[PDB]
């Protein structure tokens, strides 16, 4: 059950200790490197193009509506515990990307195939058993969080606000999905490179617009979050179920800390060493949770700090849009627009995430089948009725989660050694 979350975060504590809080110091340099200009040394696409691919998958309706679900059910304190998920999770994502170096490229052009299923093959053979299990899960798990959750949330949200959107929204999402992923990952890096920054800058500025117009409410909004999350007034650590569990569960969803579904994109980077790309990847969480999600969480609390009628019982995606429209003139239109790109981003990335784990099982023979399935399932997800889709998604992600976490624990020695190589290269 949810013991895996105690396991998942436990690695985050563990690796951060073993890696001595590496994330706080390396973060600026990795940020400089990730967005640095001008490198071509054995890779499918740029470091930047890999990050935008990973961020496209990492940024999803969980950033828009998954936080809202956590804010209502777990209280505003869930945001802080979402942060702890990312901060300690930074090390987890890094360890994922480092170990992705034990990757062998596939046939049908370079394409290259790196991921946790490969680590397990290069573990201490059981790893063959774990890797085939991981691919078995991840190949399925991609449809939930990567396809069905994101494709349904937009479809319903668009139908509420604009209402000329039965299957029509499903159709255009399928066409635009097929066009990009037709040309494989090389095509994906093109689209995710342009889409993601335009998406993120669009959303984040509006939040800073909201904060600018209501400056005074900022610090108390921080206060209620910090006052919550550490509110033991009720129950002996009974906020574990309230704020911590919802903060972690939803937080892991948005930033995808240790699900092992991150470095799959990191492998395609043109990297000299694992450490080069693994630092740019570790920035995936920071942009998702600390930047995007925190932007989303701040607006939600501010509306709660205000009075505002009728938002008291709003489900999730509608809550943030209503919370935005409350504070900003066209906030509702902004959020629903972002939701379209936010989900579309996650469809493409998670397609590659699911592909490569699928091909591990079947080879490149069925890659065409996976792509066409993903496009078809994307169409169905908008039309079909998936009320509790998040719940089954979290199970698949947890099913995906169990093996990779074991690997990161066992292969902690490899990465820490492999790190002591790259950081030595960083003095020259």
């Amino acid at each position, epitope marked *: 059950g949810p013991y895996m979350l105690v396991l998942l975060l436990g690695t985050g504590i563990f690796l951060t200790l073993r890696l001595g809080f590496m994330q706080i110091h390396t973060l600026p340099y990795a940020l400089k490197l990730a967005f640095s200009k001008h490198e071509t040394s054995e890779g499918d696409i740029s470091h930047f193009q890999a990050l935008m691919t990973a961020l496209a998958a990492t940024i999803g309706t969980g950033n828009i509506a998954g936080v809202a679900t956590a804010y*209502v*059910l777990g209280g505003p304190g869930a945001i802080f515990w979402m942060w702890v998920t990312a901060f300690f999770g930074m090390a987890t994502k890094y360890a994922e990307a480092v170990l992705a170096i034990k990757y062998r490229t596939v046939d049908d052009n370079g394409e290259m195939a790196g991921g946790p299923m490969y680590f397990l093959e290069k573990g201490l053979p059981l790893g063959k058993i774990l890797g085939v299990a991981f691919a078995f899960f991840g190949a399925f798990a991609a449809f939930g969080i990567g396809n069905m959750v994101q494709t*349904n949330s937009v*479809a*319903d*949200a668009v*139908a*509420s*606000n604009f*209402g000329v959107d039965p299957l029509i929204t499903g159709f255009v999402l399928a066409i635009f999905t097929a066009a990009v992923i037709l040309g494989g990952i090389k095509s994906i890096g093109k689209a995710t490179g342009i889409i993601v920054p335009f998406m993120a800058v669009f959303y984040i500025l509006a939040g800073l617009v909201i904060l600018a117009m209501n400056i005074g409410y900022i610090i108390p909004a921080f206060g209620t979050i910090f006052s919550s999350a550490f509110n033991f007034s*009720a*129950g002996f650590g*009974a906020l574990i*179920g*309230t704020a911590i*569990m919802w903060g972690v569960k939803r937080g892991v969803f948005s930033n995808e800390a240790g699900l092992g579904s991150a470095p799959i994109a990191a492998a395609a980077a043109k990297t000299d060493h694992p450490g080069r790309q693994a630092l740019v990847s570790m920035t995936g969480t920071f942009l998702d949770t600390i930047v995007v999600c925190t932007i989303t969480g701040l607006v939600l609390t501010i509306a709660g700090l205000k009075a505002f009628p*009728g938002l*008291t*019982d*709003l*489900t999730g995606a*509608s809550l943030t849009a*209503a919370s935005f429209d409350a504070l900003m003139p066209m906030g509702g239109l902004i959020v629903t627009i972002g939701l379209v790109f936010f989900a579309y981003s996650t469809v493409l990335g998670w397609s590659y995430y699911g592909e490569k784990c699928f091909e591990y099982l079947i080879g490149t023979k069925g890659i065409r089948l996976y792509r066409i399935a993903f496009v078809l399932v994307a169409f169905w997800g908008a039309t*079909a*009725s*998936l*009320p*509790l889709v998040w*719940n089954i998604a979290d199970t698949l992600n947890g099913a995906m989660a169990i093996p990779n976490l074991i690997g990161l624990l066992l292969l902690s020695g490899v990465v820490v050694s492999e790190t002591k190589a790259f950081n030595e290269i960083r003095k020259n």
Partner: antibody
Amino acid sequence: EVKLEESGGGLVQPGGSMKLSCAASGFTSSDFAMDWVRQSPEAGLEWVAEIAASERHYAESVKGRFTISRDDSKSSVYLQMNSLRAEDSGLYYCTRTAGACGQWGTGTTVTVSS
Amino acid sequence: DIAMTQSPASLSASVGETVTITCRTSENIASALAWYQQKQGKSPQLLVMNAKTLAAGVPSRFSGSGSGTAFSLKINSLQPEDFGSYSCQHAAGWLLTFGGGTKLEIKR
């Protein structure tokens, strides 16, 4: 303030069909997910159906015999019941859902008997 | 299915005293428990949301507490206007269930 008025209740023979209505006003039917809750003549209070604007969920007791629909243009929610049973007798209440059922309807009465 | 059992099934309270009502359920549900009050010819009225949080416009005498596997609804200094049936509901999932109900009556 907020308005929820149910309608369409009546007397229907077992195996029959009818659809209820819940004209809503005072807020945005489109943004909120809506529920149908029914109370038996013995104060049962049983949940029936869920809907948001696209997808729906049903209780196992009625799965396949109830159809919940919505019309955000006409700001009304529907519940279509067919192949009715005697146990379907109760007061059918309209309401909007999230975690607690705060804003409730008037209630309309269904009697299934020969 | 989650089964929530309420006790006592019915009680009579001498006016002006304090009473405590219990809703107990099969499995742990965190803080996702809500309380209502229903009167003759009326829909249920929300009293306490999410175990302890307080609804607006409902008098302060009503208080609810508990988490997990023990819930209690507490009324301080009852009044004859509190005569009715008190029901509990949980938000575990989307098929929210309800209790059998507790009938509150008045002593004279």
